[PDB]
Amino acid sequence: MRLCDRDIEAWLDEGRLSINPRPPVERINGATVDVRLGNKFRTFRGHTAAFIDLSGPKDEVSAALDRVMSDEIVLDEGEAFYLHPGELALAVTLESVTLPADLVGWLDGRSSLARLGLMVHVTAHRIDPGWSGCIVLAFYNSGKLPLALRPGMLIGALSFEPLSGPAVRPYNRREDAKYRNQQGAVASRIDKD
Amino acid sequence: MRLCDRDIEAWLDEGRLSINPRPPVERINGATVDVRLGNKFRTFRGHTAAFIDLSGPKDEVSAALDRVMSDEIVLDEGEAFYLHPGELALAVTLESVTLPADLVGWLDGRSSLARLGLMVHVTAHRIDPGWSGCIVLAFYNSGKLPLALRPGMLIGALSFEPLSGPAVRPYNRREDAKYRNQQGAVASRIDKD
Amino acid sequence: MRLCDRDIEAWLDEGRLSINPRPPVERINGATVDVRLGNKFRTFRGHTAAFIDLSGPKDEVSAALDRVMSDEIVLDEGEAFYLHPGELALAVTLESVTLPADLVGWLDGRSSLARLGLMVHVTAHRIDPGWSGCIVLAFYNSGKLPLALRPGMLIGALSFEPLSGPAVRPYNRREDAKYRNQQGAVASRIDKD
Ligand SMILES: O=c1ccn([C@H]2C[C@H](O)[C@@H](COP(=O)(O)OP(=O)(O)OP(=O)(O)O)O2)c(=O)[nH]1
Ligand SMILES: O=c1ccn([C@H]2C[C@H](O)[C@@H](COP(=O)(O)OP(=O)(O)OP(=O)(O)O)O2)c(=O)[nH]1
Ligand SMILES: O=c1ccn([C@H]2C[C@H](O)[C@@H](COP(=O)(O)OP(=O)(O)OP(=O)(O)O)O2)c(=O)[nH]1
Ligand SMILES: [Mg+2]
Ligand SMILES: [Mg+2]
Ligand SMILES: [Mg+2]
């Protein structure tokens, strides 16, 4: 049972859910709220490491991650990020979303973007109960043309599903949660596993 | 709450939900209905453009789109569409689906197709309340062999989720909705944002 | 509605669904249960075949699948599988999962993995009511570095959604179901279509 548009509004109105800035009525429809693209990005520098050991020693993994990740890119006014076919990049939503303990969120991309090969997540689109922050995007261009991405564009959509009850270990209370207070296009923290 | 198979049948009998043609009983099971491939495709002409500006002047965007999209391809008796590794293609379902204001639909592929690398959507699989039309597929072959696609093959599954109530701004009434009554392998209308 | 963590635990306590071995409390949180990578893999041998006719004669398809699919690869203690950019491979969860006729499961990857391009499914992530067995993973590396995967690592998450009622044709009782009693890194059985 996803929340319909009307019930998304009522949750935002009660304060059970928060999205900041609040998208206007025109971006709240059916069962979704549209989200927008941020201005923070990150790319990869492959020439600095051979591989990433997903479950290796924490120090080695951490060092490899630091070598391979670019600095955070902040786009000048009227500047685009050019996402080329075959390229994975990180970005972020404009909006910060905060979920209560009794709700879960789901990121979709967009059919218009899908038909040009742009994936807005890499089999990870769950926004957990207790989540609070902007949402980091893993972009991949599976199409044949480079896509110019500009801050402010409509980039995806969120839906919302009540849980069977309130989560007992929501994300804000989980001591081994990686992504609380998530600022900008944060890189993988797989080394904290 | 997804509609189970016997409730999918009930909703179809009752007529607010429509799938046309209606899959037989052997194709409605668990919490899904199987869907089949149509006969309309499009491909991409990359040599005609440097990039697509996904937030550019509506005129320039609309023109770049028109250069890069192939004419709609319609397949002869016994023809295959050969989907090569690394290529994005557009196709269409056989079936047309109609959802009322109080239902959302979700498109899956198939595990049998997944194990050969066939993706059937590009992070965009929500079928909205109020949707009426055949579903456009953005295919991507992530695998190691070309896959021959033939009209009428089983291509994916739809499941259906009641909303918390009837959407106030369903897809069929939304004046900025891009794809109402969609009737072939329709290219991106990202230029209408 | 998804089951919250506390309810997931209840359903496990009561034998309502099964996950074997049972993940500990630190892996059940919010609306999910974390799952782990098994030790069986398959790759592809593209040189043995020109293509796969998904919808062709059953005979010929089966022969092609048998030529292209590798023998099952079984990794030792501590051993790694190197998943390189642009390569699909098959693998399997550590956990076996059994769902009743009134529940559907859903498979997510992990944000930490998404941010390095690891897809854990290829648009096929539904676990059906009536399912019983380990889950075959279709892995694709959309990123810029190779990724070492070790048996036992955290690979993804499961969420569980009650259906509108019991499925009348759950997976365990459906005649043309392909994947009952599976079986390690089982290849595509699309030839059974
Ligand atoms: O694989 C898909 C997924 C969705 N749709 C349809 C169903 C849906 O109801 C509609 C809108 O999808 P979305 O909202 O993801 O696309 P958009 O580019 O944002 O279009 P709009 O601007 O109309 O919202 O397009 C498809 O045809 N194929
Ligand atoms: O990543 C996944 C996703 C699903 N499955 C299992 C669970 C599910 O219940 C079953 C069938 O899924 P699906 O119907 O998508 O596969 P199919 O190719 O259509 O097979 P069938 O003919 O048995 O329906 O396979 C996996 O092993 N791995
Ligand atoms: O596209 C996404 C998807 C999720 N998240 C956030 C929301 C979510 O609540 C959290 C964790 O998601 P996941 O559990 O998939 O990540 P993990 O790698 O398993 O992190 P953790 O160890 O903190 O659970 O990260 C994003 O920022 N972007
Ligand atoms: Mg939309
Ligand atoms: Mg199936
Ligand atoms: Mg997690």
Short mmCIF file of C-alpha atoms in Angstrom, two decimals, chain A residues 1-2 44-46 49-56 65 68-69 86-88 90 104 106 119 122-126 128-129 136 138 140 161-170 174 176 178-179 182 186-190 193, chain C residues 1-9 25-32 34 82 106-123 125 140 142-150 153-155 157 159 161:
data_model
loop_
_atom_site.label_atom_id
_atom_site.label_comp_id
_atom_site.label_asym_id
_atom_site.label_seq_id
_atom_site.Cartn_x
_atom_site.Cartn_y
_atom_site.Cartn_z
CA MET A 1 0.00 0.00 0.00
CA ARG A 2 1.93 3.00 -1.28
CA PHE A 44 36.41 7.72 -10.29
CA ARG A 45 40.19 7.60 -10.85
CA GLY A 46 40.87 4.02 -11.91
CA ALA A 49 44.28 1.06 -7.93
CA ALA A 50 43.97 -2.41 -9.45
CA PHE A 51 40.73 -3.42 -7.67
CA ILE A 52 38.63 -2.81 -4.59
CA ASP A 53 38.38 -5.67 -2.14
CA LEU A 54 34.76 -5.49 -1.02
CA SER A 55 35.44 -7.45 2.20
CA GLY A 56 39.22 -7.03 2.72
CA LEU A 65 38.61 4.21 -1.82
CA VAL A 68 39.98 6.07 -6.53
CA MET A 69 37.41 8.73 -5.62
CA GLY A 86 29.72 3.52 -19.80
CA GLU A 87 30.43 5.94 -16.96
CA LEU A 88 29.39 5.60 -13.33
CA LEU A 90 27.91 9.97 -8.02
CA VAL A 104 9.93 3.20 3.94
CA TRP A 106 11.66 3.93 -2.75
CA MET A 119 19.99 4.74 -14.45
CA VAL A 122 22.47 0.70 -9.04
CA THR A 123 20.16 -1.90 -7.49
CA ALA A 124 19.88 0.24 -4.31
CA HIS A 125 16.74 2.40 -4.09
CA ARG A 126 15.39 1.83 -0.57
CA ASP A 128 15.01 3.41 5.30
CA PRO A 129 12.72 4.25 8.20
CA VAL A 136 23.15 10.03 -2.95
CA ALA A 138 24.66 6.31 -8.43
CA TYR A 140 25.07 5.04 -15.00
CA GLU A 161 4.97 2.60 2.12
CA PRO A 162 3.79 2.29 5.74
CA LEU A 163 5.52 -0.58 7.56
CA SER A 164 3.65 -3.29 9.47
CA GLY A 165 4.60 -1.37 12.61
CA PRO A 166 7.24 1.06 13.83
CA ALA A 167 10.80 -0.13 13.14
CA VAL A 168 12.60 -1.05 16.39
CA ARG A 169 16.03 -0.35 14.85
CA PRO A 170 15.43 2.57 12.49
CA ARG A 174 21.57 2.02 14.15
CA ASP A 176 26.67 0.64 12.41
CA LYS A 178 27.08 4.37 7.38
CA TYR A 179 25.14 7.29 5.88
CA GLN A 182 24.94 12.50 4.60
CA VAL A 186 29.31 10.89 -0.46
CA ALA A 187 31.43 7.97 -1.75
CA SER A 188 30.99 4.30 -0.77
CA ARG A 189 31.76 3.56 2.91
CA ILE A 190 31.99 -0.19 2.32
CA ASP A 193 31.50 -3.16 7.23
CA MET C 1 3.08 -2.62 3.52
CA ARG C 2 6.44 -4.16 4.34
CA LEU C 3 7.17 -6.07 7.49
CA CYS C 4 9.14 -3.93 9.98
CA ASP C 5 12.21 -5.58 11.57
CA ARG C 6 10.30 -6.67 14.76
CA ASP C 7 7.62 -8.38 12.63
CA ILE C 8 10.26 -9.99 10.42
CA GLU C 9 11.63 -11.50 13.64
CA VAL C 25 19.66 -9.43 15.16
CA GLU C 26 22.30 -6.97 13.89
CA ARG C 27 21.29 -7.87 10.25
CA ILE C 28 17.53 -7.40 10.74
CA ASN C 29 16.67 -3.71 10.85
CA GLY C 30 14.13 -1.14 9.61
CA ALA C 31 12.22 -3.08 6.93
CA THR C 32 14.99 -5.52 5.91
CA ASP C 34 20.69 -8.52 5.12
CA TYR C 82 37.11 -10.87 -9.39
CA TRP C 106 11.96 -8.30 -2.74
CA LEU C 107 15.76 -8.22 -3.31
CA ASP C 108 17.82 -5.02 -2.98
CA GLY C 109 21.51 -4.49 -3.27
CA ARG C 110 23.31 -2.04 -1.04
CA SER C 111 24.04 1.64 -1.33
CA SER C 112 27.76 0.93 -0.50
CA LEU C 113 27.85 -1.44 -3.48
CA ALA C 114 25.76 0.82 -5.77
CA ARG C 115 28.35 3.57 -5.29
CA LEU C 116 30.96 1.27 -6.88
CA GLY C 117 28.66 0.00 -9.69
CA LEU C 118 27.75 -3.46 -8.33
CA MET C 119 24.26 -4.45 -9.47
CA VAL C 120 22.94 -7.53 -7.57
CA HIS C 121 20.01 -8.25 -9.94
CA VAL C 122 19.27 -7.50 -13.58
CA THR C 123 15.70 -6.21 -13.42
CA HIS C 125 14.21 -9.09 -7.91
CA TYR C 140 26.95 -6.80 -13.20
CA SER C 142 28.84 -0.97 -14.03
CA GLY C 143 31.80 0.84 -12.34
CA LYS C 144 35.43 1.62 -13.16
CA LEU C 145 37.29 -0.85 -10.91
CA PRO C 146 37.17 -4.60 -10.58
CA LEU C 147 35.54 -5.82 -7.43
CA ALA C 148 36.72 -8.78 -5.35
CA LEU C 149 33.73 -10.69 -3.92
CA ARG C 150 34.36 -13.22 -1.11
CA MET C 153 30.21 -10.92 2.50
CA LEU C 154 27.02 -8.87 2.84
CA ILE C 155 25.59 -8.71 -0.65
CA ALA C 157 18.78 -7.07 1.51
CA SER C 159 12.03 -7.01 2.36
CA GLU C 161 5.29 -7.79 1.70
#
